[PDB]
Amino acid sequence: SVFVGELTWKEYEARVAAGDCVLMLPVGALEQHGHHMCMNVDVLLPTAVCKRVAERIGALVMPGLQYGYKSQQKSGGGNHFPGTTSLDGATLTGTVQDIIRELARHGARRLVLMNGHYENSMFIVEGIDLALRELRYAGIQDFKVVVLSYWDFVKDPAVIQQLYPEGFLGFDIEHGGVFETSLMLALYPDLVDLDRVVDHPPATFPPYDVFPVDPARTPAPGTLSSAKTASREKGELILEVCVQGIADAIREEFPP
Amino acid sequence: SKSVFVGELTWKEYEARVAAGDCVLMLPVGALEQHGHHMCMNVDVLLPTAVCKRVAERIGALVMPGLQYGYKSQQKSGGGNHFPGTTSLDGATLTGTVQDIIRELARHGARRLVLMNGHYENSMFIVEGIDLALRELRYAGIQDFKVVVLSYWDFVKDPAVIQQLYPEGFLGFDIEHGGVFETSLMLALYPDLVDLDRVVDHPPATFPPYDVFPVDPARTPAPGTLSSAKTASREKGELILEVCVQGIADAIREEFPP
């Protein structure tokens, strides 16, 4: 297994003793994903990508962070939905910070943080900075971190044309939409019930945000766009592009 | 999709259950910690989650995603935080995570939570998280949120059971880290993650009535275990499991009446 949790400490130690061992940490969330999908999607997807990437380039995967930052209206629907269970920014930042400090203690020096929940980004970044600051204080400056959101590797125009034949509107409305639902159909079809999809128009917002979150500004089902056209085929295409692109980046940044 | 695991439900399935009136939520709290040469490191997550799954199925409760990282491993209970693999959180982080989740469950309208600890060292930080959350709920005007905290192993106290588990004599849960107790449960639940042939049959670990910091590696058995899992078995694991599941289910039934 490529999962750190499924190894003995001796097995883990041997791998880190190699000197060039790469570790990967999935950072997700428990967030509503419409009427047609489960709430652990943001954990499941990055974990699935990490698994395949780790198997492809010989890395190990740390247990994923199940809870992420508060859902935002324009990206996740809003934190007023039941089910969505979010952490305060400081909590997520401190979790990332503690994990990095511990990996450094192990002697590990290569980490790939793979985000699956849009809202986590800056808090992951702060956790990285704070940990690196402490490592410098501990006399460690050879620890390198690569952070990314897996969907950012799906930029190729040819690929996008295949996923959105009718036309591409952007990733702005991709919460529980075609993109995530397609991946789930390819990975965990038993957790997707396409017949429950509410085919509503794409959500649109002005160039500003309002707080407290106004429930009237998010589509009733919680999705920001319809997943009606999602398919296992699109999911497999997305999956291959992401696994391929990320494996390549890791090979470039963390050569053996 | 219908499941006891909240993560596998759509928000409507979850909302429907909470709207039911007296929904009980369970939250496994584990750790990523070394467990000798014979077992994997996510044992403290796997075990309380497996117990939660079975209890939930019997009493109709739901299980929240488990906390994968716990408080720093202590020499006398988990071998110590100097071992590789063990990845621990600072107390404030664990406390804050528990606090945040309770704040959110309350917002959802849930009012019944069972926190099932699988990592000894987590206890007091889970407790502080609960107290800080209940304090905020009170400020929010909520005083009917009830929390039950427990470590599944505490439900295995029946002398008859203890005798079956330790026919050679019981020394106590004191040295039960990667020992007979946890290993047997793993053999009954995740045999593939256990390799009894790698077990180091060393004598029970003993310590003086105090602790030393920085942690002294010499005071912990080399394998990381505090006792030998040499006599562990699937059969013992099955007895432990059923005992914990039946006992915990009854506890919830009494504390969270319909």
Added chain:
Amino acid sequence: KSVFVGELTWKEYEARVAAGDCVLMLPVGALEQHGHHMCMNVDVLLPTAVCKRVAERIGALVMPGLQYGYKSQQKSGGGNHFPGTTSLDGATLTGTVQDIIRELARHGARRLVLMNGHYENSMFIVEGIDLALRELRYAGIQDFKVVVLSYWDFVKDPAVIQQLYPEGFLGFDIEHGGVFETSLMLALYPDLVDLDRVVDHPPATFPPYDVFPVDPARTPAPGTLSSAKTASREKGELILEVCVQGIADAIREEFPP
């Protein structure tokens, strides 16, 4: 007098708030390197200038701006390894925003517009808003409304973009010390800009990921992510009116008398 709260007496401020529908605006910037051709307080000056004009036009008041913001990121601001750039930890920025909102609530104010001028500040401003609103709820206050925005997001009209980038627009992705900010500065503070020092280098391109610690080799030496060679006062005057008008209308919509 002035729309700046700092330039009012406490009685004049009290009278404005007493009106019952007073709107307050808070610029949030940073002290950050902006190439060889511009000064480092750009992110404070610009949102403050926009706030000043929106506030005068719609009758709102402007709070003292936050001079320091979150750590500069490589892909948006060049990186926090640059000298001069002086950044706050996230908790610090979040706490300042949270504290100011708590105080405005105490004054009896209930309408706030947070105008970001530094890309990286966004989520920390958002957390400060959430933590403060959570407290107001505990205090029994649930009628406080906050609008948060980055002024550049109001410059989207295709026609406007065409006039600013007649050669083609490459997204605000590389707009750190580039045509957009420099043009605004040429229209507002020409004395703090010297186009003769602009380094006309091709726009910065990055892979779809980030590396830490920050690698200096991945940021154009000058600190800019794109060249401000084609910047001008006229372009700045256009950007300024589009922003002021747009934000002013957004406020009239969300905060009606």
Added chain:
Amino acid sequence: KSVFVGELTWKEYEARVAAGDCVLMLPVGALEQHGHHMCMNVDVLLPTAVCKRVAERIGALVMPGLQYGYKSQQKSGGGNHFPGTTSLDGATLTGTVQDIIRELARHGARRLVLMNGHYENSMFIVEGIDLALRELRYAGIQDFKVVVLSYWDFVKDPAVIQQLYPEGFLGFDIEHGGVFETSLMLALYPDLVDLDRVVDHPPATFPPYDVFPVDPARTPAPGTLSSAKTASREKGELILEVCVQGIADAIREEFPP
């Protein structure tokens, strides 16, 4: 002059640490209800009394004891719903331990014995130690050693237990305001104990789980988890000498010349 740092001049203290092998001891207690028969500062009085005697024997120094500890838990201290009990949040206690260690390290001290007298303090003292040691490591200090213990853990000899509980031993589990602490108080602070006020009730029994908010109905009315009726000055003297000798020996072992 005195083993207590608080009663020393800074010169006397300095000279003692200047010796090079000075051992410091920090009592950590609490202000907590202790039934109808004893005062509320017991948790600090006891560890402080034990430290004093140990210090006088091995030549150590005793720091002012922490008067406020972590929240009282139902199964160990009755619960934090009792009046009088005044508890700190975990972070506060941890921060205090952490600050004291930092300061002692600054003094040049490198040997500390933390003696806990309030069960619930345990994990927060441990976290304070770790955070402090982490900082000391960053400061280039890695020769600072800490011994942490709860004085009652040194009373484990079967024979001694026999003289304390000749009627049978149930365990320290129910020892809150019971025979153990009450006996020590009778031998150390007899004027703070009115054994005639003891409410004789069966030992407290709890299911293998905890409930929050704490349910007052699950704690014996008086606040004690067991009866102190059989407590005596004689048992106190026995417990005391056993603890002092055991702890002095531990210190000699962990902090040799």
Added chain:
Amino acid sequence: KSVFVGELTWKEYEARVAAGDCVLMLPVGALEQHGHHMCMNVDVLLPTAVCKRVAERIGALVMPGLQYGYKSQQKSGGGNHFPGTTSLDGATLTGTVQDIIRELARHGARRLVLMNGHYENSMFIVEGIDLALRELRYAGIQDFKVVVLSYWDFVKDPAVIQQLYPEGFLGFDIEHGGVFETSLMLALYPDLVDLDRVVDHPPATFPPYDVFPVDPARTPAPGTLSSAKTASREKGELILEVCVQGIADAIREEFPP
């Protein structure tokens, strides 16, 4: 049944608070060097003794005094570079005061007098009070009243000052280990003061600013900011009676039955 909460059983404490108008007092001190002639716990001993006497006269209760305070400052306490002085970070002191106030409110207490004995503590005690009152408000409690004071502020009567300083008064700015505190200690804890060790150096003078890291050369070698050579037990008795009567009256005025 004394005035010290720590020496009361929870039932006795509960009865006093149940009375309806119970006043609680909390001494806030420090462990700080006090020259060659006095022990280091002077800052907790003095306010505690004053509280004890005020409480016995007005019927109030005294909580365990805080033994550790904020970092000693050069111009007020000699500086935090001295051995012995063991200080808390500001967040720690603040949180301790906040936690205690929160707990007193839980008990049902609504009247508190915080008596400071360490100058540097003041602003952190103030923040602790504000943060706690903020939470009480969120909890629905708005009748909790707090009086904060440094016992020495009650000694400003010209006739009194003339008695204590017949050679001329220069102010309390240099009263660290000086005539004022030493005289009080001679009247309350003679065994902890060794006047024969006083260093009769001239009053410390400082420029109108401070330097960090603290410069040891700017503090008089002994640690004292003024000579306590003219300190006396008689002067201490005068200061004591003046403070006690003054504080006792203040409490009557602020907390009328």
Added chain:
Amino acid sequence: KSVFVGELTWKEYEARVAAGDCVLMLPVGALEQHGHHMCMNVDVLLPTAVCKRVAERIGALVMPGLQYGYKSQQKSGGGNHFPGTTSLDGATLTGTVQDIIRELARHGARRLVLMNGHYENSMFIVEGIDLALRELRYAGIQDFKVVVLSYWDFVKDPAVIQQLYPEGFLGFDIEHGGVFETSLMLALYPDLVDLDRVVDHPPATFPPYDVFPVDPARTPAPGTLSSAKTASREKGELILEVCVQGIADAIREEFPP
């Protein structure tokens, strides 16, 4: 040519810092009510104005000033119950100071002058400095020197005070929106002062203790602690030149090349 860091390019700043001996100055103020006759950003304006003139005379640079300070206290600034006054929690102000010093140390700067213009900021600035210096030590930096001061502390010459208060000097205790600040404002920002609104009430007098929640009845209605009726541009010019020369000399002495 400007001495303000915000008005420099990062290249200009880098050159100055790398040149060595570069003294940075950070003004720390507040947004606080200053009576019926003056604006609320006085505490920012004054120290910033002093820094500018001092910097121009000794070759130092001035960082963007902190616009928000700690909570206004009744005896020094009227109280934090006034509208307009917008204050930070202590931790927030302390964290801001701490983050800035950390960053300046990263730039290679090693000399900093913190100029406070809001009385209540003092101790939180001090804690910010201590925490930052602690981290710098962990980073291997032990040559960073900080000077902290309140500009008014340089106005203590009898001849000067006699010239400013030709009717008896009572002290700076009642100096909040009084003759001192109002005079400085008349010499620097006359348009932000309207002496015709000055309320000529007697100086404020308070008992030797504080009360919380703050009691509005104990603060002069206008918010001023003393009357500024006798304020003048001439008195302001004298104060300004005295402070500028004094601070310039202090810096030359503490920060020689």
